[PDB]
Amino acid sequence: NIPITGSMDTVYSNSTREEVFLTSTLCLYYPTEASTQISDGEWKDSLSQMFLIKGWPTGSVYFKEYSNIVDFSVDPQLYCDYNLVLMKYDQSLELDMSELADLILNEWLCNPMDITLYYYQQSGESNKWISMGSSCTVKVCPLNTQTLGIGCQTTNVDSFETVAENEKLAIVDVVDGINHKINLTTTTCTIRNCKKLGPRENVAVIQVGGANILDITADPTTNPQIERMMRVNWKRWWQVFYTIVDYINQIVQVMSKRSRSLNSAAFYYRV
Amino acid sequence: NIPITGSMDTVYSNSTREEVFLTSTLCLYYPTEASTQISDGEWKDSLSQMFLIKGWPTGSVYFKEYSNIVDFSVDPQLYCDYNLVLMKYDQSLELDMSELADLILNEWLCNPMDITLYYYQQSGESNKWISMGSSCTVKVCPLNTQTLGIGCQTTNVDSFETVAENEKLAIVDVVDGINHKINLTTTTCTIRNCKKLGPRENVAVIQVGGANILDITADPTTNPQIERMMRVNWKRWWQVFYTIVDYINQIVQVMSKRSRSLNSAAFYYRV
Amino acid sequence: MEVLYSLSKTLKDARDKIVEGTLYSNVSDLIQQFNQMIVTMNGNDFQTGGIGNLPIRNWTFDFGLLGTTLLNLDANYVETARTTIEYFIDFIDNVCMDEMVRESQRNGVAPQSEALRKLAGIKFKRINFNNSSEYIENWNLQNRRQRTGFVFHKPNIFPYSASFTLNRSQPMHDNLMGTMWLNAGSEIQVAGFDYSCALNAPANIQQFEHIVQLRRALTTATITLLPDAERFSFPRVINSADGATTWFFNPIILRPNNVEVEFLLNGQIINTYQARFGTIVARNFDTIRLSFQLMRPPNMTPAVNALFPQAQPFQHHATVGLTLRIESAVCESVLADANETLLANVTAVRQEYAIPVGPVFPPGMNWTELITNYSPSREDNLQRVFTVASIRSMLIK
Amino acid sequence: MEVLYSLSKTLKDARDKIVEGTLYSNVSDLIQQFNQMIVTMNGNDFQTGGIGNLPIRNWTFDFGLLGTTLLNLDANYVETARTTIEYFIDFIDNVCMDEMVRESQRNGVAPQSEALRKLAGIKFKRINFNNSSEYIENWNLQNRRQRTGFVFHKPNIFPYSASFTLNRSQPMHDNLMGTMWLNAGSEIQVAGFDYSCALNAPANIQQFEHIVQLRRALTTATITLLPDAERFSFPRVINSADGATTWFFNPIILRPNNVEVEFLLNGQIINTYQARFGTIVARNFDTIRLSFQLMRPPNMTPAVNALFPQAQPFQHHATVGLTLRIESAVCESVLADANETLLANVTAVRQEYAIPVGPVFPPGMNWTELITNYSPSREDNLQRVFTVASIRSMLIK
């Protein structure tokens, strides 16, 4: 990117809220239990009308149901332009909720790994391995410079140190600098070596249940709170949706349009 | 549109072909009989590998099969960034092929019509009514100043003047400046009042069969052979597809980036 | 500097009037003036050149006065006079070259070239002969500051510029509208064009306007205004404004209706010619506003009707042009011309000796970039070097 | 104009030295000068004003000489002298005022104000008394062309300019890097900021550079260089380059390590100082290159460590800065300062009578637009009016 000079006395431009709502799409991702509690089915159209009151065109708001948190965790495809992810917190799903939130909230440049053949290190702090599928069970075995396992025999998989089992998604970090031999269940899960770029400013995750538990930064030392990790108490999904619709201006202001030149085609939902 | 001044001595810029091939996507709409005659199914992957030689990355090409021309006419969504439409010509399908070509090649601004309440005029030359559905049989009864039929009785649908029968897609032009009553099978077919804006730069139509017959301009006087209505003879669909792949540079040179502040959201296959 | 002009004038008149067989009454006054020049220049040493490749040369003056007893000139008289005159002409030419090449940014009117700075002193005022040429008398007026004036035939006042503007556009460049012009030397050629041929314009009238700003206001200028601009009336392909792509257009020339030409001085409408072609005049004008229109022909033979369709394609693009020559003008400041070799002389003298690029004139003295920015310091130095070029061209053509 | 300064000087001397009881020894030569001035100015008719609201006035001089037979000055001498002197002071004040309101695009240094133009004539050359003040001295030197020097205290050579450049930018403006600067008056405050605090930079060192070009080459300037540019060292909300949105800037001031200032004249290293704050000297220069480095500290207490993470957010934004005052300087061309009141005098005289915007100067004569484009013609007019204002301030305050 070339330099961009600017003056400190340029007059503030007119507001672009009208332009952006006229030329962007809002993109809700809600759990199926939401609709089941709603017990309706004109509600998508009614919410589209209530968004039209706020300013979006009639078709610019797109609702996407998902089964539950882990089932959305496997392969999150965000087919649209400003992504809101409703996320109901329930106990024992803290880590998988955090994994999903991290994966959608950060941009990842990443490429496959042929587990059965090579041994893999990790470049540094911003290099994880992302495993996705029906049932991922990573079983790692660190090696030495002599290529012999430590805490594990290179052949006996039974001695491999499991670090996740039966998770739809797993963002696994291992010691950075050690050649690891991996076993992962090639049929029902695939593992890809991924590196963390800047934030994915296109998404925003709304935790619906209890206290702040999301820790997208895998580092223990830092647990930053991002503007895009919203949290709202709830008892009724209608109340949740009404709050989101009413304060959509604040949400989309907090969120920003994506900025990353992709090399891959996909189905987006644009205007 | 603000003015944009430009010199007449600036040096020609380098070739942008590689930039656009890396930044855009191509998508081919072909009939099912193409695959039937090809008698294969590694052929999509083979053609993607073949395009990669001409310089389109692996994910850039999207093959969207459609059953046949009349069935694809009904509300065609062109999920792409550069659209090719292979269009096999058969005798007696001239008007329907022309209808589809007009629809996709020309940019339309369409408004809903409520046949059951209002009698509709046509504003001028650029206005048409497009009816799309499983079987559209639009019958028109023109009306007087006192809303009484001429050549028809407003309440007897049998005396109406049929202008399309059982057609998946009909672009009807009636005499401008006269109110009409419409009978169209409301459960099956949807009719919209559309105005033709400028052309759509995104799409190109490769007529595959016979003589130069497409007439996009409903005016009898003008029959302009637009550059995007390409034509080629055929005996083998493999030969057709190899022709397209070899001459892809010329086709996308003929086409150009779409330019319109749309308002209707829809899925696109962009990178 | 007026001393330099008087030296050139008296040497020219010596070369001309001192000829064999002529009466002495024809040249009594000239011989007296030549003797004054000899006896006032005697004893003075001059240093010329020393910039670029222009060689350093020293001039010393010790000459004998021309005779006066002779009642009718003969071969001896004229050849001795020629021996003196050749040396003097050489000195004048070298001084003029020096003052052409030298430059200044503050007080451009002042003499550079220490030879000319010496000549500007008070001792050499007795040489002042008469200041009659147009350049020298404008120079004396400036020195005595008053209203100067230079008469120019076809003055190149416009910087060379070919360009266009698109008031309606799109990436396909298939339906455009706007203007496209050249301003070069003394010619303005402006052509408005519309691909729709005013299909949707109000009343089928498309408006085009083009405002040209002169660096110096021209006085009592004769102009030839014709319709149907030449250069913008044949099919051609032009790179877009960004330069990313190129766009075609195929002109169909039309009558430019209710054309107006305003000649403006400080935004004040000084002259206004409405639908009048041929030769026109402007008293005093700093800006030219060419306004014209493209009217869709209300009636149309089938040929033209097929030519301009109501549909989209627009395969032939309607245009309407205007050509405007400035045949002659009077300018307060100095300009190059088609009739005067002053700019050519100055530029040639700089190039022949490879003068380093100065702080005020542009590299190579290209007139286009010199008149695109024609600041007063640049004007002062230009007037100085042009007047020196006139003085030199009196002798060395 | 030299004669105008002589008039002002001799009136100031007359008002200060012709006082009750002072010996004739103290004032004999002054009386001789005054008598010469009276004799020269008698029998003339000057006209002053006629531009804007400045009223036309007519000045006629018929004043008797001053006595010389008095051993020691008494009262009556002083009253006669004063009734002459107030008239002369009013005349000189009006002449300077009318001169300060007139411009000339061509030949600025030549006088305007027909009164002053008449004073320039050969008749009044016997008034030339003394040319002592700095401004008249430099005027005489320019006419006597050679080096001129004006010594300035806090010269406002820098046009007002506040702006930033971003070498790493995102539409969210959360991980930025670049510089900001205020050049105003004699201040250059520059601050290079990095939001990541040099994580991925080579060796955790981020190089910041800032180039400042002077419109005139200052000479022998004392410059106070300090770290920690204050103005860019507290939270701020800055409009983006195109004004679309506004970004947040939350400084943490690191040391600027291995700073390096280069003072350059015609693009060659004239002076260089590394890690040398306090009072420095620029011998002769035309541009200032300030190059500093943001070096991430390797060792950190936990507070600093918490401030600068390796992660994405970057709540606190590291920065370094320099402040550079030009305490004093010497320039070849006239400038405004924080010491002399010449710009104030000229601007006040223009505004008092509502002079219309002239050809050469900017509207209102604002120093930012006057110095940002400081062409030679503008410099000529500015020197003329500044010298006239300095002349006027001798008598009128």
Ligand SMILES: *[C@@H]1O[C@H](CO)[C@@H](O[C@@H]2O[C@H](CO)[C@@H](O[C@@H]3O[C@H](CO)[C@@H](O)[C@H](O)[C@@H]3O)[C@H](O)[C@H]2NC(C)=O)[C@H](O)[C@H]1NC(C)=O
């Ligand atoms: C344009 O013309 C067609 C041709 O008639 C119209 O179809 C008519 O639609 C109505 C309502 O759907 C049908 O009414 C039916 O009547 C029977 C008894 O008459 C009753 O059992 C049904 O419950 C229903 O009410 C009518 O039969 C049908 N006509 C035919 C010949 O089938 C069509 O509705 C017209 N378009 C519009 C917009 O009205």
Ligand SMILES: *[C@@H]1O[C@H](CO)[C@@H](O)[C@H](O)[C@H]1NC(C)=O
């Ligand atoms: C400019 O801002 C004002 C807010 O007072 C708004 O009413 C107006 O529509 C805006 N104009 C544009 C062109 O956005």
Ligand SMILES: *[C@@H]1O[C@H](CO)[C@@H](O)[C@H](O)[C@H]1NC(C)=O
């Ligand atoms: C992992 O270990 C199990 C049990 O030994 C084996 O069936 C499976 O093939 C192994 N997978 C890989 C990728 O080695």
Ligand SMILES: *[C@@H]1O[C@H](CO)[C@@H](O)[C@H](O)[C@H]1NC(C)=O
């Ligand atoms: C454009 O083409 C020329 C000739 O092939 C080449 O020298 C130049 O580098 C190209 N431009 C760019 C930006 O690479």
Ligand SMILES: [Ca+2]
């Ligand atoms: Ca998980």
Ligand SMILES: [Ca+2]
């Ligand atoms: Ca083990």
Ligand SMILES: [Ca+2]
């Ligand atoms: Ca790691």
Ligand SMILES: [Ca+2]
């Ligand atoms: Ca953490």
Ligand SMILES: [Ca+2]
């Ligand atoms: Ca009938």
Ligand SMILES: [Ca+2]
């Ligand atoms: Ca049809």
Ligand SMILES: [Ca+2]
């Ligand atoms: Ca019609």
Ligand SMILES: [Ca+2]
């Ligand atoms: Ca037709």
